DNA sequence: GCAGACACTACGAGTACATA
DNA sequence: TTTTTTTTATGTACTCGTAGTGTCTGC
């Protein structure tokens, strides 16, 4: 039936075959499940890569719908997970048998980096003592906020960023299941602006399809507000080729015409600053100045002065690069 | 029972002559405990930082026949023999050691009902029973209200008749 | 349109005070047969199956079947200010969120209408096996509550055994062990105080005391409780209300590992 | 029945099967054979075998009296101030009939989680009842255990397991499990373990379940190379004011999905123990802290980490 | 093998409630003559000497002399669930670490078997307290409990003075002064209320109220109590039970006289 | 049948720390 | 050869004191 859902939740990989990228990790987890050798897992990686979807597909594969509420204990950062919960419901769930059917139980701890260190220290002997009865899956974005004692007990899988070559067919499946007219440059802009994230590629696809009705390069870069590659090349050419006043006028006209933001301009100019074969003394100064300009934009600071400083960081090094020869 | 006990408990000092502390501290604690013989045992005869202790050992008594410092405080780094010196000096001067350490409840009501029991009563063995020397181990872990209870029972003018070692 | 009518308010107060520290949220399944509630606890160890009959209410009408999930702290605060001898009306519309509790003051003069907002949890149905048990014991509820309270002072996990002789409770704790065994207490003037054994095969299972003590809070609901045990199916505590329905408590055994030696 | 993972299935039950720290493990074997064991606190890195050594020593000392002459407490238990007074002291006062040279053993696993008040209350009940009971504590951070408790026990310290010590136990597990392997695969497992036997067994079981053979690429398709092994190289490149190679390593760590907090934590961890000038090390640490304040306040991009690397390279050329 | 079948659990309940907050442990000494318990406080303030002879039980089996050092709270936790009029089987082995109590307390054929883990204590020895008391009086237990509660209402310590006329109790406080005068009350029908005086050389001492209340909490244990006090010898209360034995409480006086 | 006493858990309050 | 005190803004955890309150005893 038709449902009113966001496309990041309407199109969720309910099975392990619907995830795209981490084929070796998913093959190893599938062979863990099929041989009943599932250990305590530690899924870590950047957001939007499919860790919660992986553990929910594994839990739906392991357990039927008539027994899913008694075998799976799913706790996350929206739940209270203090040390009284580790000593309370989690220990009682781990230390007791099942109700309906005999089997091993699963305690999913989503956002395990949000737990306090007291709870993580209390979890160690709960994990180690009841390995036969229950299994634990810790999922985090930052591995440093998990204590090394819990990192030793759980085998860790790095759910790295999704490569855009493998991100395309899932987006094509979502497009063909939603009747969306998309061009090749629209798909390329989607997998460029996503940057290893399938949430942001679905959100941007749904937002562009609602705003314009078609998904092309211009529509995606207009709905997102991101500058194009040609605009960044023009900004760099103006900052390296002419004086302060003409470059300031041209960049100000380009920003007023297309409604660009200085954060995305700074990000793309930072990406361009390493491809350009600059001297090493020039690159250090440019990176320090651009990091300072990016830091100044985090508060109530006028963006026009920061645009002038972004021009100034290159107008300083123009004559240095030229006289270097 | 050589294989039954630890080597610290096997080689623990049982007399004054086999202690390993500073001899000045041993003599000062022994003289401070022997200053209570006029009010505890009822006998006139028993048988820098050093200068203040020597002055306080010879400073005289209050008209209530007691030393002017009714509490001895023993401080130092761990692993020296402070508890050993307190127990050896208490058993050497004819006292019976009453121990009150950090494994007790240390609430002010329990602290009061233990100090008042150890210090304000005589012996249940009648004549010839040893007096009670209250040794309070780990007093720095006690709460401030327990210290206020100890100071209130030290400054009751309910007069304190027994020595207290902290 | 759902409209039930409790003739007295005491039984609903006892039910919602029995489940207050145990059940996270109440799922009233409404049909023409009666009111059903199958809900697990917050630890996913216990299970509560309450079945209230349509003949026990004053008036009961139910056009279409409903499944009303509601919070329990709010309903506990509503039922705290309810009398024990007043008629309490539960109302619910077809496509609305307001579950209405209408009752009277303890002064019995003014009316009170307390609405509740229904929750939207999608809960998969838990399949009760309804199989035969290897041990069925009919015993008084007050003695069961007393023996659970007396074993709570000794330990935390209790080994309950049952055989042809009778039920037996053991608590191997820190002070020591406490082993209480009861049997054949039917030779009294009362009919509620009786121990009857029906089934054959002896079973020994270890359970938590906190959940047993939460289960014993339904003592005023039934004078006689039933204990069902087997080697695979969990512990069932059955309270049979007089003319309203019944209440089932399911508690899973704990994981006990023998010594390697 | 369900098969246990190889961490829990191949836990050693005898003290001779424990590899690494041969002097301390040999003395624990002697103490388990004879008796009269002093109070013991074992400190070390995770996965070294401290809990295994404590449990094997307690089992070999007691035998059939393990269920009545041992009290095991963890961080999953309460062990507050009301448990040291009322449970540990009552177990130390408890009469258990034991052979000569054998005592009751109170195992306090993960003693860092205990509060300071509980450790203060533990002192006199450890010192008084030492004729009848003994204490066997295990910990990771030895500074959390206070000085009187460390004075009341023998403080054994475990070091990280060497590659040969991990390799011997892994070859025992391989010959027990009939795992086909190559030498570069076991070298990769030893490299990804980093002194942790738990991680070695977990990586070996993951590679054997996912691929069925142990070579280097089958290990690295599921396991990962350690972070500080490249962070040390990028810090060395920042010392020589080489911003291009440092940014190459930074971009390689960025494209692998590491958050800026983890990257700057590894950068601080390497710079804390790096071999360079002390004043330059302090300037590096101050610049890392200044960047980490911006990372924690909300701005955390590749431009900020590149600016941190540029500032570290500028600190070299500005005496 | 030690077995002792106490015919009624009421005396065990009243004893273990009398020395509940008084002594920290129970050191039962087991011989063929009976059960002895000689406990002393750590501050040497109060002493308990309980003797239960073998003729006062339903049965008594004892092969070897035993020392049962057991916790007080762990036994109070047992006999909060015991029966007032029921048979209590206290059993132990010769070389064992446990102590079992079997009873049918609710009179509902509910076989309750509570085991305790023995506590190993250092074997201090107190041989015999010397008994040469000049002032020996006899008093009912209920009146003594009521007058100890009456001074507990006002003061914190009792000045007890023996005399030929009677035992006079005094208490000082900010709210008021509590004072009674004991007279010869032998002209009544009850023989338990009669006060028999066998004193000489009168003595006035001071005692703590809390230990006196803990001693007088055993009023239903025996109908009549015996008080024995003298100079520099601690005060003795003595409850003579009907068939099982006797109980003696020793209280040391305070240093601050009067 | 109703006043007094007992322990019981829920709740209010004060304090410390949070890193490698 | 040398020692007092409360600010940082939440969130959690520990510890301790206090107050309704269910239940037991007694005349
Ligand atoms: N590998 C993937 N295959 C298909 N859809 C994906 C994949 N990764 C992410 N998605 C989409 O993103 C949604 C949410 O992914 P999550 O499971 O939340 O990823 P995650 O990496 O666990 O996120 P964090 O780290 O918890 S914010 C899914 O329901 C999909 O719509
Ligand atoms: N002369 C001695 N020879 C051998 N062992 C000794 C000697 N004096 C003391 N000891 C032992 O060394 C320890 C002395 O510490 P204690 O006096 O018990 O406590 P402490 O010295 O106050 O240190 P802390 O702060 O309590 S840890 C005990 O284990 C004694 O048995
Ligand atoms: N030295 C060792 N020899 C053999 N196996 C070991 C060794 N160390 C660890 N293991 C294995 O790793 C498992 C975990 O060992 P533990 O003793 O629990 O680690 P740990 O030293 O306690 O570290 P932490 O601080 O508790 S996480 C054991 O059950 C063994 O399977
Ligand atoms: Mg997620
Ligand atoms: Mg000491
Ligand atoms: Mg461990």
Coordinates of C-alpha atoms and ligand atoms in Angstrom, one line a residue, chain A residues 12 47-48 50-53 55-56 74 110-111 139 141 199, ligand 4:
Chain A
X12 CA 15.2 0.9 3.8
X47 CA 26.7 8.4 9.3
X48 CA 24.4 7.2 6.6
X50 CA 23.9 1.4 6.7
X51 CA 24.8 0.1 10.2
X52 CA 21.4 0.3 11.9
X53 CA 19.8 -1.1 8.7
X55 CA 21.6 -5.0 12.3
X56 CA 17.8 -4.7 11.8
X74 CA 17.0 -2.7 21.1
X110 CA 22.5 1.7 18.9
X111 CA 24.5 4.9 19.4
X139 CA 27.0 0.6 16.9
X141 CA 30.0 6.8 14.8
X199 CA 20.5 9.4 3.6
Ligands
LIG4 MG1 21.4 4.4 12.9

